Coordinates of C-alpha atoms in Angstrom, one line a residue:
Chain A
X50 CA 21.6 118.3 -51.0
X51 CA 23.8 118.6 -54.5
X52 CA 26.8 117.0 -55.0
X53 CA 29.7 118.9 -56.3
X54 CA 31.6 117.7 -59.1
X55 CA 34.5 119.8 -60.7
X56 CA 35.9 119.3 -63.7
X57 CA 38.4 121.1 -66.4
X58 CA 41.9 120.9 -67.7
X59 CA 44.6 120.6 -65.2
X60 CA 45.0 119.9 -62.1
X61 CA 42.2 120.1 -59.7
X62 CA 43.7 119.1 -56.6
X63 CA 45.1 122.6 -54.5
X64 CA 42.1 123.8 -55.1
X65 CA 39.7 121.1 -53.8
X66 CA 41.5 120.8 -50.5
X67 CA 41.6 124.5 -50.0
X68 CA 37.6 124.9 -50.8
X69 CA 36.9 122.4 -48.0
X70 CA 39.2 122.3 -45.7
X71 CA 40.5 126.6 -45.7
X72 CA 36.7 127.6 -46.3
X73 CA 33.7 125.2 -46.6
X74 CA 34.6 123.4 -43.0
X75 CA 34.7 126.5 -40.8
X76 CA 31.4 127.9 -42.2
X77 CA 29.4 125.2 -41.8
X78 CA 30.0 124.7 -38.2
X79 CA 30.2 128.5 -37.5
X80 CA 26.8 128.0 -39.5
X81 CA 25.3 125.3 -37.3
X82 CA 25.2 127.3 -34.3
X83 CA 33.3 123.6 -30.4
X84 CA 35.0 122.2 -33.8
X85 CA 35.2 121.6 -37.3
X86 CA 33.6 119.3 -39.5
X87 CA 36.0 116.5 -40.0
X88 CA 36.7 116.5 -43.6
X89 CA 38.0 113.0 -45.1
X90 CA 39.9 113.3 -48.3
X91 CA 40.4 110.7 -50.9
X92 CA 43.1 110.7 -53.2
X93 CA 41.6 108.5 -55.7
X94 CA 44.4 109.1 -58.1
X95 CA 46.3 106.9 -55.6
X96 CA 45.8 102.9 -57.5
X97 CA 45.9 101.7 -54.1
X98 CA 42.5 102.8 -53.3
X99 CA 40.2 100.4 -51.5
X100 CA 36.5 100.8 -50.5
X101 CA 37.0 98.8 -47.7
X102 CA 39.5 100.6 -45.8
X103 CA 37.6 104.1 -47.0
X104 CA 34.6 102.5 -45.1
X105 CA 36.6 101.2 -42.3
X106 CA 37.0 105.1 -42.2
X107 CA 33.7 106.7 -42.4
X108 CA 32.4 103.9 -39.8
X109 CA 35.2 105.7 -37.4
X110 CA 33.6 109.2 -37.7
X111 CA 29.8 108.8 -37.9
X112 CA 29.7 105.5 -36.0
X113 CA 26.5 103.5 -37.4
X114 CA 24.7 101.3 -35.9
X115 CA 26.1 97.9 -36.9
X116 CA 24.3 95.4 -38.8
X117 CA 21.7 92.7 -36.9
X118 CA 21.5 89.2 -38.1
X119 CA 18.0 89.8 -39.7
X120 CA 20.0 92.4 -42.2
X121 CA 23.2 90.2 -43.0
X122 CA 21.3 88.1 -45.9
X123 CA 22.7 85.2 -46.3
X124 CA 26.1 86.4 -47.3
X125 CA 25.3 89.6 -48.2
X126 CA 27.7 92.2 -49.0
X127 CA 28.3 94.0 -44.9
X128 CA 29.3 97.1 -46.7
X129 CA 26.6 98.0 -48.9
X130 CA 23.6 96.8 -46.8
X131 CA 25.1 99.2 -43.7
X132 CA 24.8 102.1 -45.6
X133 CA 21.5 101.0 -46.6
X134 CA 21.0 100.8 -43.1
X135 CA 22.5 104.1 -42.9
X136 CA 20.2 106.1 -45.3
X137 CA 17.1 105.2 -43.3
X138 CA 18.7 106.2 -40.0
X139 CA 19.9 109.8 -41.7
X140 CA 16.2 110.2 -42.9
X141 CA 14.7 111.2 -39.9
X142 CA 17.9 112.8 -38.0
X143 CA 18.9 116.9 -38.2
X144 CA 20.0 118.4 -41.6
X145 CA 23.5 118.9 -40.5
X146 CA 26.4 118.2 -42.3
X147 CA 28.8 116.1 -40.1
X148 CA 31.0 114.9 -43.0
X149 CA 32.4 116.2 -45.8
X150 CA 34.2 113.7 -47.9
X151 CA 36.4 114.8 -50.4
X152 CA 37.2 112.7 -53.8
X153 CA 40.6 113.9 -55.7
X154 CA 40.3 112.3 -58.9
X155 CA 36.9 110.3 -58.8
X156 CA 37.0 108.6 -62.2
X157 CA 41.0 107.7 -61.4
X158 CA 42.0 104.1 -61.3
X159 CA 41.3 102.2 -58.6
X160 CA 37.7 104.4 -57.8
X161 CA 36.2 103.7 -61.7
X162 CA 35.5 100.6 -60.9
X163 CA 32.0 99.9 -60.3
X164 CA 31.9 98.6 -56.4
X165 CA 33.6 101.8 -55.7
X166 CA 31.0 104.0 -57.8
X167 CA 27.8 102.4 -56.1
X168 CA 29.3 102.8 -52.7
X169 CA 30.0 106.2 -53.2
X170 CA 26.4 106.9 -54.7
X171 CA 24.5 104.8 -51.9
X172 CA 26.6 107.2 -49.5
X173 CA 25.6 110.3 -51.5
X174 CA 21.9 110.1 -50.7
X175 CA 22.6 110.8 -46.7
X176 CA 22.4 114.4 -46.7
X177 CA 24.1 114.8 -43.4
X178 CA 27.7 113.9 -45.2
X179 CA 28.8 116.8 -48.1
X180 CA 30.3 115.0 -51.4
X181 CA 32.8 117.6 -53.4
X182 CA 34.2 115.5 -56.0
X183 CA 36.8 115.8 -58.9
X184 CA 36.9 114.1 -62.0
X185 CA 40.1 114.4 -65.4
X186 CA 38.9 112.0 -67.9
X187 CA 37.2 113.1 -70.9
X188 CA 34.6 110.2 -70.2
X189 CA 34.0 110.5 -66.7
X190 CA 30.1 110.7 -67.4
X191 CA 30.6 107.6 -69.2
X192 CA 30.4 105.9 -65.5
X193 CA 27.1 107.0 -63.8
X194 CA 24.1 105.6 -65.0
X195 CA 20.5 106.6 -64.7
X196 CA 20.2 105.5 -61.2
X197 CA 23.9 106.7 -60.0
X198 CA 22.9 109.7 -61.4
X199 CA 20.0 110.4 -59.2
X200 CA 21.9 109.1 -55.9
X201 CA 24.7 111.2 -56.7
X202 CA 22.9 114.6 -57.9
X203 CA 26.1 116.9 -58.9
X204 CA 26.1 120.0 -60.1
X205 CA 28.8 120.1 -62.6
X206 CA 31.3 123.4 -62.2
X207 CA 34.1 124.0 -64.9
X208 CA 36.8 125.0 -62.9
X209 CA 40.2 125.0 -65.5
X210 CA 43.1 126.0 -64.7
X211 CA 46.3 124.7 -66.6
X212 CA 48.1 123.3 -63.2
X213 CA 51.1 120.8 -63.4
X214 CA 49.5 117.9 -61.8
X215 CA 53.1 117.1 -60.0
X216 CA 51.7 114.7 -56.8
X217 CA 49.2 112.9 -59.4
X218 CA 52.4 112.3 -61.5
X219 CA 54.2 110.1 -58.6
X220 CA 52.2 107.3 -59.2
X221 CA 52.5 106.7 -62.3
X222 CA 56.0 106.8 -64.3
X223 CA 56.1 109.9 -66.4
X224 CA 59.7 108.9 -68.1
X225 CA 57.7 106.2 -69.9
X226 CA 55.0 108.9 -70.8
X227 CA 52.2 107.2 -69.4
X228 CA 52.9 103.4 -70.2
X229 CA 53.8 102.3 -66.3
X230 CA 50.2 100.4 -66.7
X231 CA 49.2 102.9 -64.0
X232 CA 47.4 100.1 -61.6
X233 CA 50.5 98.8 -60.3
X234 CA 51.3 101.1 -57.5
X235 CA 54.9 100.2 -57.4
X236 CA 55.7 103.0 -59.2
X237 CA 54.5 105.3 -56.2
X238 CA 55.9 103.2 -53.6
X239 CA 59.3 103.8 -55.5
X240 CA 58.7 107.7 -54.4
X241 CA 57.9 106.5 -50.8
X242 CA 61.1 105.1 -50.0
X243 CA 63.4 107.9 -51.1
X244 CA 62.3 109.8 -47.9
X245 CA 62.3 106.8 -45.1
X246 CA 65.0 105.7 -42.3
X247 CA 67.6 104.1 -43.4
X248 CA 66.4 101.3 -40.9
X249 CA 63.2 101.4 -42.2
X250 CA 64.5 100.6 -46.1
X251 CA 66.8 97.7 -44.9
X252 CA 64.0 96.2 -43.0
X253 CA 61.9 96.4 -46.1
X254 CA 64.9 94.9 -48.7
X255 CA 64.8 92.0 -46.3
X256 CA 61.5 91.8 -46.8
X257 CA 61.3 92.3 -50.9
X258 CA 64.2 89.7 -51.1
X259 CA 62.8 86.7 -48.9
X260 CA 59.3 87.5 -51.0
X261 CA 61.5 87.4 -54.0
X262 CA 63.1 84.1 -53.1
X263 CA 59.8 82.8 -52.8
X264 CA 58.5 84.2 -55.8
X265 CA 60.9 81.6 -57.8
X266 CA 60.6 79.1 -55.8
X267 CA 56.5 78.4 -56.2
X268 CA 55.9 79.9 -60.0
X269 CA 58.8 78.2 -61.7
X270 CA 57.7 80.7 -63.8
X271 CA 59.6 83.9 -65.7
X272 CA 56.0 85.9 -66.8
X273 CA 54.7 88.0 -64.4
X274 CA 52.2 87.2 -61.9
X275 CA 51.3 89.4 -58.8
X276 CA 52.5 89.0 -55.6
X277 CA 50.4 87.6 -53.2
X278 CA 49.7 85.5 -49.7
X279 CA 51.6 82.4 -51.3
X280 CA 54.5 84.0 -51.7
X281 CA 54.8 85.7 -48.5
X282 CA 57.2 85.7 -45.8
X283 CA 55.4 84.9 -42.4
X284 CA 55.5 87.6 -39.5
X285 CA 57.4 85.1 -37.1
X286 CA 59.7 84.3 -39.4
X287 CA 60.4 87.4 -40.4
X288 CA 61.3 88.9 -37.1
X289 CA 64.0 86.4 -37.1
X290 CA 65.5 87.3 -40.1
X291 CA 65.4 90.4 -39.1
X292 CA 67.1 90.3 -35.4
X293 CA 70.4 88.6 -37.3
X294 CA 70.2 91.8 -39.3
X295 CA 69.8 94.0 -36.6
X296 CA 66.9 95.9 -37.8
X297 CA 64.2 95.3 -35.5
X298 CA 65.1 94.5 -31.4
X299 CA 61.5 93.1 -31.2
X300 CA 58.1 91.9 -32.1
X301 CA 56.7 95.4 -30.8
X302 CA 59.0 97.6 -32.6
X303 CA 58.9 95.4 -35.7
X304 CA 55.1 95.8 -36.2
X305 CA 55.5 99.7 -35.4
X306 CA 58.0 100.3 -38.8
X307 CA 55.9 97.4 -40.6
X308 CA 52.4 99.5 -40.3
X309 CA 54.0 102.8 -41.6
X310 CA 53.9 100.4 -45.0
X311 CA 50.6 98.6 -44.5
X312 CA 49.3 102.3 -44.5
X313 CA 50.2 102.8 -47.6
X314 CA 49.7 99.3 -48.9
X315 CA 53.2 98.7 -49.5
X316 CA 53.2 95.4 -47.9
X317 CA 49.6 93.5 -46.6
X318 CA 49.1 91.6 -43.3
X319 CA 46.7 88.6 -43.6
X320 CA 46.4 85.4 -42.0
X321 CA 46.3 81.6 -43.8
X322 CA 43.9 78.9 -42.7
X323 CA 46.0 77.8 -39.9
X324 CA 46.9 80.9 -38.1
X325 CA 50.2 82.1 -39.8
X326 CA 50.3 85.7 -40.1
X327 CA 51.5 86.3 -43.3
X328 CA 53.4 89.5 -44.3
X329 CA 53.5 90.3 -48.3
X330 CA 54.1 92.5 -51.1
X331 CA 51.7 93.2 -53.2
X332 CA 53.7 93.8 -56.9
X333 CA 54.7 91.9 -59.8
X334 CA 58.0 89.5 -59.7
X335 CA 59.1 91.8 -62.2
X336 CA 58.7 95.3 -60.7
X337 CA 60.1 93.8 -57.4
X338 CA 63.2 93.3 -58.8
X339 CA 63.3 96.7 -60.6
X340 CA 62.3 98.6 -57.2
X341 CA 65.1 96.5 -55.2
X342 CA 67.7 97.4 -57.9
X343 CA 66.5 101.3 -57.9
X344 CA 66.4 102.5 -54.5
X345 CA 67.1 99.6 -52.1
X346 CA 70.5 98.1 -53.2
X347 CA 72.2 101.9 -53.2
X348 CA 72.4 101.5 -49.1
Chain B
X62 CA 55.5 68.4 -36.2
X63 CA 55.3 71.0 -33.8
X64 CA 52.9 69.5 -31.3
X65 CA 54.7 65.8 -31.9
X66 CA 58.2 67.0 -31.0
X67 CA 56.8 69.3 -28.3
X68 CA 55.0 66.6 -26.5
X69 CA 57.6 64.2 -26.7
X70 CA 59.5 66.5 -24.8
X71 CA 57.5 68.3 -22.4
X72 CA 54.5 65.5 -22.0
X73 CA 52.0 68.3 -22.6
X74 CA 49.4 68.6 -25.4
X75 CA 49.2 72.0 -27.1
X76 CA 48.3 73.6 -30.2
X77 CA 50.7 74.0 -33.2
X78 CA 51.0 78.2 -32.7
X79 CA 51.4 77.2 -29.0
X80 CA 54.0 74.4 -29.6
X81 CA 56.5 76.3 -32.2
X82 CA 56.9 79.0 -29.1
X83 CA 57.3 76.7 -26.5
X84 CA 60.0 75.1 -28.2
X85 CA 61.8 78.5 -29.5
X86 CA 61.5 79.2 -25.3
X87 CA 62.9 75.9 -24.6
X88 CA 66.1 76.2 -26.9
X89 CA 67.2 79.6 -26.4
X90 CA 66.0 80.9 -22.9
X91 CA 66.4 77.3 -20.8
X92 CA 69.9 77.1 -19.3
X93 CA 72.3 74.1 -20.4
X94 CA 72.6 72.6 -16.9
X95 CA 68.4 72.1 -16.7
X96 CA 68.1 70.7 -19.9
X97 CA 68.7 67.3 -21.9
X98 CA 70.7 67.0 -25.5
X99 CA 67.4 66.1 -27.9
X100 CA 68.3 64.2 -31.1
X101 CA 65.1 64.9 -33.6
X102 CA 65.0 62.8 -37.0
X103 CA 63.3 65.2 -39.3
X104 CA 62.1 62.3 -41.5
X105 CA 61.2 63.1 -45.2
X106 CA 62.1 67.0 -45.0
X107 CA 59.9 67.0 -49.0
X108 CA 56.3 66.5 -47.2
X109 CA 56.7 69.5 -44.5
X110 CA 57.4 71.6 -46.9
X111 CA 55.6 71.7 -50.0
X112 CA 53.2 75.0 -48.8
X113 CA 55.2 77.8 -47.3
X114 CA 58.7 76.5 -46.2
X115 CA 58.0 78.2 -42.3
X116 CA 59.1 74.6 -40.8
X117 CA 62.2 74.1 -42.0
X118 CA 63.7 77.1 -40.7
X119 CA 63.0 76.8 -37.0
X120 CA 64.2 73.5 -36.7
X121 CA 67.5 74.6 -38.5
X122 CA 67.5 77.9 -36.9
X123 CA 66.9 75.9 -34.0
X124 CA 70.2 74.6 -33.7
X125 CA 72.1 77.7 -34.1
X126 CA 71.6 78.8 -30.9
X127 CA 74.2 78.8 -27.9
X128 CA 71.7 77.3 -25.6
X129 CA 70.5 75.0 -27.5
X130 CA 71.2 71.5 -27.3
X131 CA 69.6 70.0 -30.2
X132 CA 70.7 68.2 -33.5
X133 CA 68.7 67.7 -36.1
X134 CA 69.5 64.9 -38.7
X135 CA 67.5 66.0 -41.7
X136 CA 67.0 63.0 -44.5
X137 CA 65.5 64.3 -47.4
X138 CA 65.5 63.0 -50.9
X139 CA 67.6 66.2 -52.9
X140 CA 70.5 67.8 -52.3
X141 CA 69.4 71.1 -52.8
X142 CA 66.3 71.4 -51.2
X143 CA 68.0 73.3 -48.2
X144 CA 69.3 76.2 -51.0
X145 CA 65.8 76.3 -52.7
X146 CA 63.6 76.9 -49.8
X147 CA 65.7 78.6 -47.3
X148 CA 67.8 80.9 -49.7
X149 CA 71.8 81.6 -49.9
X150 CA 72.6 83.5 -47.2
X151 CA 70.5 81.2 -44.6
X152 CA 71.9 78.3 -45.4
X153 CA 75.4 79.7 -45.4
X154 CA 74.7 81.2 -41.7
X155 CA 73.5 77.2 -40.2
X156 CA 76.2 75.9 -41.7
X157 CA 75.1 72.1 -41.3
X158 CA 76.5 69.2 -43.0
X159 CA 75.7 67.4 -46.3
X160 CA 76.0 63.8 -47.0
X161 CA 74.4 62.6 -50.1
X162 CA 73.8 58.6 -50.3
X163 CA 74.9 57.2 -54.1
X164 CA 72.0 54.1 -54.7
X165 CA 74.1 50.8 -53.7
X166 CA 76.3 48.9 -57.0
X167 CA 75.7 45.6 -57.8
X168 CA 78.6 44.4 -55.6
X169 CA 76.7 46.0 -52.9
X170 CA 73.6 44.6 -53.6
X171 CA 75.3 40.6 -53.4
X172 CA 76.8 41.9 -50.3
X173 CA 73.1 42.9 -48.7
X174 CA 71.3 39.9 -50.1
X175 CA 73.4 37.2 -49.5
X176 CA 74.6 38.9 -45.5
X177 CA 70.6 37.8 -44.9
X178 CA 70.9 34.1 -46.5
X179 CA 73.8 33.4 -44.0
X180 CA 72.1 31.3 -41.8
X181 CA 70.2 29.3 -44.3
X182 CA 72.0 29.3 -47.3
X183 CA 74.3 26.1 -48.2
X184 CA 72.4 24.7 -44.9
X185 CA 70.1 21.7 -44.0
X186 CA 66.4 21.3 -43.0
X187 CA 64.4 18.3 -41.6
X188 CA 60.7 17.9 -43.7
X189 CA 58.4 15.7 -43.2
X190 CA 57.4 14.2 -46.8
X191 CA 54.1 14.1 -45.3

């Protein structure tokens, strides 16, 4: 029932995903007695982290019972009072571990912040789910409290090592030696599209330069401001621009090259209050323009 | 605008979402020999478009097509509300024309005030003083 958090100088990330995936997930099935323990990772090092797509997860693998109308208080918060829901089912059930989630980088930027910490410590009480964390800042016990402590448990290890850190050094510009803001994201979506179809880049252009035109359009405004559902091209519209530019032949084939992107958060789908379905990019005016000049406009 | 034009065409009532496709069916996939030529005044273009620009598009992109038998005559009150919305290389690939109306000069205006006193001016009238 211990937590597992590692910390130390360097990079802890080759060894956390060889631990549990190469060694911790075939022993505890061949222990429970067929397959493995399905093992979600996290790269929280990633600033495109939501707790709200890494629930949408878990609630695929252990399938809860959802929430009755006697629970949802009132606007309550759905996600934190299912796995409140959660623990007291897992309190009575076999100790078997059926999970074992896997946090890269647990104090990185998008997973410090607080609704992130107390859903992973609400999540750490079921002991039927394994938590084997990572943490590199120097104040990483900074963030748990007396009560996140207890929920969470760990047992600290010292595991340093000295490595490079080369995959959590895409996100986040190492030219500028560490002043790319590192919450932007951008800066790892510039390392995304060096490896796509050349389709799949021209289709994405379109899309960065109809935002763009946009962008100018409703700020009248130079300083930057995010990008978001105002700004955004339309998914209807867009297939048209689209068609004239030959990139996608459909609606079908269209939304099967746009989700490669909303997987990696590249560009969001949402709908407006009248049924639009809005398609946008979710960076500054300013680092759109830098990312369409860098890798887009070469062709 | 969608469910006005739409019904004015068709005689059915449908949703907004509904109405956009049924016209974007009507213009490009109806043949020419089932359909009627359909003049729409899009009348002060400002007001549609003040939220997210989606509506000027289709009616312009409406009237690109072969099949198609629509013109649109777009008043507005700017010149360059077309290339702000819409972009460069939209408004380029429409290729409409652009009239701009200069406000009337005072020769103008004596021309349009006294072509309604015509019939009454320099004229006589019977009153009763009573």
């Amino acid at each position: 029932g211990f937590s597992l958090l590692f910390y130390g100088v360097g990079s802890k990330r080759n060894f956390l995903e060889e631990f549990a995936i190469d060694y911790l997930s075939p022993k505890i099935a061949y222990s429970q007695l067929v397959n493995s323990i399905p093992c979600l990772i996290l790269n929280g090092y990633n600033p495109s982290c939501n707790y709200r797509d890494v629930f949408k997860e878990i609630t695929d693998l252990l399938v809860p019972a959802e929430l009755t109308r006697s629970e949802t208080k009132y606007w309550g918060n759905h996600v934190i009072l299912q796995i409140q829901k959660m623990i007291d089912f897992y309190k009575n059930q076999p100790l078997d571990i059926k999970l074992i989630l896997v946090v890269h980088n647990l104090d990185g930027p998008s997973i410090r912040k607080n609704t992130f910490q107390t859903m992973l410590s609400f999540l750490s009480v079921i002991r039927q789910i394994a938590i084997v964390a990572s943490t590199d800042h120097i104040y990483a016990p900074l963030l748990w409290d007396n009560m996140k402590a207890q929920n969470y448990n760990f047992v600290f290890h010292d595991i340093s090592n000295f490595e490079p850190s080369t995959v959590e050094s895409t996100f986040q510009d190492v030219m500028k030696m560490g002043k790319s803001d590192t919450s932007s994201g951008a800066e790892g979506a510039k390392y995304v599209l060096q490896s796509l179809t050349v389709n799949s880049k021209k289709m994405y252009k379109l899309l960065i330069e109809t935002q763009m035109q946009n962008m100018g359009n409703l700020s009248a405004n130079t300083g930057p401001k995010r990008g978001t559902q105002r700004t955004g091209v339309e998914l209807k519209l867009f297939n048209h621009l689209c068609a004239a530019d030959f990139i996608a032949s459909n609606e079908i084939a269209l939304r099967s090259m746009l989700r490669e992107f909303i997987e990696h958060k590249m560009a969001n789908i949402t709908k407006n209050n009248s049924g639009m379905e809005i398609i946008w990019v979710p960076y500054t005016y300013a680092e759109l323009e830098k990312l369409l000049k860098t890798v887009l406009n070469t062709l | 605008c969608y469910e006005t034009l739409w019904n004015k065409v068709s005689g059915e009532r449908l949703t907004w979402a509904a109405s956009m496709e049924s016209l974007e069916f009507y213009f490009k996939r109806v043949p020419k020999n089932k359909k009627k030529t359909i003049v729409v005044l899009l009348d002060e273009l400002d007001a549609m478009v003040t939220k997210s620009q989606d509506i000027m598009y289709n009616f312009f992109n409406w009237t690109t097509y072969e099949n198609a038998k629509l013109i649109v005559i777009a008043v507005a009150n700017t010149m360059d509300l077309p290339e702000r919305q819409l972009g460069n290389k939209i408004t380029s690939r429409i290729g409409f024309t652009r009239i701009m109306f200069t406000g009337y000069t005072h020769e103008e205006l004596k021309n349009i005030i006294d072509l309604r006193l015509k019939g009454l001016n320099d004229s006589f009238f019977y009153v009763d003083t009573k």
